[PDB]
């Protein structure tokens, strides 16, 4: 319960989390209210993956230690939140956002997580859209690799039962052709 | 790319699928086309007796 | 294609003329005496004599086996990869909008939650400020 | 008017009882074996036997294209549109995955903002007692 | 719609070969068997 409950939940996170360079991003937030949380998001961010390892996390990550807090003070502050907010917007108008978002931006634009939106220089869209091509050809390199041996696993598995069928194919059809040929015969026979 | 990665993805799903039940496919399939063979040479010989015994009786 | 009861391919299929299911012939006449006349799984009369009806195979067309490499396993196969296909983009489709209003929901109430933690720092810092000058002001 | 599942029309489409939304019956079919008879877009359980209702209407007849008056045009064509299906769905994934890394990073923002609410609004409740008590004890003229 | 009497069955499982993993293989795979369909099908028509 201490632990962040985002760590807990099915959503995905990254495996190295790195608190100082989060830290050091948070303090540069000229909002002072949002560099607080953006802060105290890369403290619970780092308290997450220390507590909580990760497959592919590196091993003796030092927790991170942060004040204890009520169920009721939590409670009043999310509805204190819940108060401030504003018109919750129906999701005909969210769904028109996201199209014009899918329709200006375009889809292999939005796919990628290193687009950002005040990254308006074509040389960085271009160095990331390089380093996403790289990255999937090596993904593709890995998985054809790994394809390529299940592929011959299989092959050699199934070499002797390929064999056989094909035996076997070449028997019914030669029984077919023989089949055909002896009600041919047959007939002229009795027709004989 | 995310072509040929997504073409590998099934391909890997696909090889998976084949290491879970080639054997039992591939036995249905044996037993299936020796079934049909041998319909096929039963036909072919009761065809053939047919004719052998018009021949004998001719 | 196999026996109802015996389970295996059978040399002599026979159809039943009120459920239409193949079995052997022999498997079939055992039945039949064993159970009164009596189908399968059916809980009605079936006619040894009329009620089953012999399945007869004709071989003119070249034999095609039930192989990979056919056009109609080739088309099944491809029929049910895009029938996967269209069921991952529309689950995927689904998740992605659920996470796009969640998205914005979050989005709005990060704004809200920023306004009230912008809110209450100047309601602290007023506060502090009182007590700075109070603790100052009492000497 | 297009089947819900596929989002195009469907040969055989079939209507629900209670939502009355088109689809496809195979699709609806899948669908349903897939996530235990879960109607698509709704919680609500519908039947594959007795809540779908099938439509029997005129057949929509496709005009078929001059292009695709031979098998090789036709096979292009089938393959353009499976590798356009396929980008398609690696690219919502991908819109997917990265919908739910910006979720997640919100998420994350949303508790901390919480739990920095809640920090000060303890800190503005102590300030508040202690003024409190400074005007208690102070003599206000 | 009378004459006709359909047979309830268990499905025929097809042999899946493990060189046709892939779609662009299932491609050439039913391009081939479609060009093999049309060349038995013309020397059919010439042997007749």
């Given at each position: 319960?201490?632990?962040?409950?985002?760590?807990?939940?099915?959503?995905?996170?990254?495996?190295?989390?790195?608190?100082?360079?989060?830290?050091?991003?948070?303090?540069?937030?000229?909002?002072?209210?949002?560099?607080?949380?953006?802060?105290?998001?890369?403290?619970l961010?780092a308290?997450?993956?220390?507590?909580?390892?990760?497959?592919?996390?590196?091993?003796?990550?030092?927790?991170?230690?942060?004040?204890?807090?009520?169920?009721?003070?939590?409670?009043?502050?999310?509805?204190?939140?819940?108060?401030?907010?504003?018109?919750?917007?129906?999701?005909?108008?969210?769904?028109?956002?996201?199209?014009?978002?899918?329709?200006?931006?375009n889809?292999?634009?939005?796919?990628?997580g290193?687009?950002?939106?005040?990254s308006?220089?074509?040389?960085?869209?271009?160095?990331?859209?390089?380093?996403?091509?790289?990255?999937?050809?090596?993904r593709?390199?890995?998985s054809?690799?790994?394809?390529?041996?299940?592929?011959k696993?299989?092959?050699?598995?199934?070499?002797?039962?390929?064999?056989?069928?094909?035996?076997?194919?070449?028997?019914?059809?030669?029984?077919h052709?023989?089949?055909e040929?002896?009600?041919?015969?047959?007939?002229?026979?009795?027709v004989? | 790319?995310?072509?040929?990665?997504?073409?590998?993805?099934?391909?890997?799903?696909?090889?998976?699928?084949?290491?879970?039940?080639?054997?039992?496919?591939?036995?249905?399939?044996?037993?299936?086309?020796?079934?049909?063979?041998?319909?096929?040479?039963?036909?072919?010989?009761?065809?053939?007796?047919?004719?052998?015994?018009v021949?004998?009786?001719? | 294609?196999?026996?109802?009861?015996?389970?295996?391919?059978?040399?002599?299929?026979?159809?039943?003329?009120?459920?239409?299911?193949?079995?052997?012939?022999r498997?079939?006449?055992?039945?039949?005496?064993?159970?009164?006349?009596?189908?399968?799984?059916?809980?009605?009369?079936?006619?040894?004599?009329t009620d089953?009806?012999?399945?007869?195979?004709?071989?003119?067309?070249?034999?095609?086996?039930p192989?990979?490499?056919?056009?109609?396993?080739?088309?099944?196969?491809?029929?049910?990869?895009?029938?996967?296909?269209?069921?991952?983009?529309?689950?995927?489709?689904?998740?992605?909008?659920?996470?796009?209003?969640?998205?914005?929901?979050?989005?709005?109430?990060?704004?809200?939650?920023?306004?009230?933690?912008?809110?209450?720092?100047?309601?602290?810092?007023?506060?502090?400020?009182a007590?700075?000058?109070?603790?100052?002001?009492?000497?």
């Amino acid at each position: 319960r201490r632990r962040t409950q985002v760590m807990q939940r099915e959503l995905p996170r990254t495996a190295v989390v790195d608190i100082d360079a989060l830290l050091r991003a948070a303090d540069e937030i000229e909002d002072p209210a949002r560099a607080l949380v953006a802060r105290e998001a890369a403290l619970l961010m780092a308290h997450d993956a220390a507590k909580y390892p990760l497959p592919g996390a590196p091993p003796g990550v030092k927790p991170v230690e942060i004040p204890r807090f009520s169920d009721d003070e939590l409670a009043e502050a999310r509805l204190q939140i819940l108060m401030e907010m504003k018109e919750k917007p129906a999701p005909e108008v969210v769904h028109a956002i996201w199209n014009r978002r899918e329709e200006n931006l375009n889809a292999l634009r939005l796919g990628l997580g290193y687009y950002d939106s005040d990254s308006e220089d074509g040389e960085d869209d271009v160095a990331n859209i390089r380093a996403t091509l790289e990255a999937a050809l090596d993904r593709l390199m890995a998985s054809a690799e790994k394809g390529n041996k299940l592929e011959k696993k299989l092959n050699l598995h199934l070499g002797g039962y390929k064999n056989r069928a094909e035996m076997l194919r070449k028997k019914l059809g030669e029984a077919h052709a023989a089949l055909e040929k002896a009600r041919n015969a047959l007939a002229g026979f009795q027709v004989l | 790319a995310y072509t040929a990665q997504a073409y590998l993805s099934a391909r890997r799903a696909h090889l998976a699928l084949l290491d879970t039940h080639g054997k039992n496919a591939w036995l249905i399939g044996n037993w299936h086309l020796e079934g049909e063979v041998k319909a096929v040479e039963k036909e072919l010989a009761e065809t053939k007796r047919e004719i052998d015994r018009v021949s004998l009786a001719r | 294609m196999l026996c109802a009861l015996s389970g295996e391919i059978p040399e002599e299929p026979v159809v039943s003329k009120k459920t239409g299911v193949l079995f052997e012939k022999r498997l079939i006449l055992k039945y039949l005496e064993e159970h009164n006349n009596i189908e399968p799984g059916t809980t009605e009369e079936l006619d040894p004599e009329t009620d089953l009806l012999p399945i007869k195979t004709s071989r003119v067309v070249r034999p095609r086996p039930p192989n990979f490499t056919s056009i109609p396993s080739l088309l099944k196969a491809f029929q049910d990869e895009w029938d996967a296909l269209v069921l991952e983009t529309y689950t995927t489709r689904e998740q992605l909008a659920r996470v796009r209003e969640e998205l914005a929901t979050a989005l709005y109430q990060h704004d809200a939650a920023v306004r009230v933690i912008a809110r209450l720092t100047r309601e602290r810092d007023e506060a502090r400020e009182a007590l700075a000058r109070l603790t100052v002001t009492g000497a």
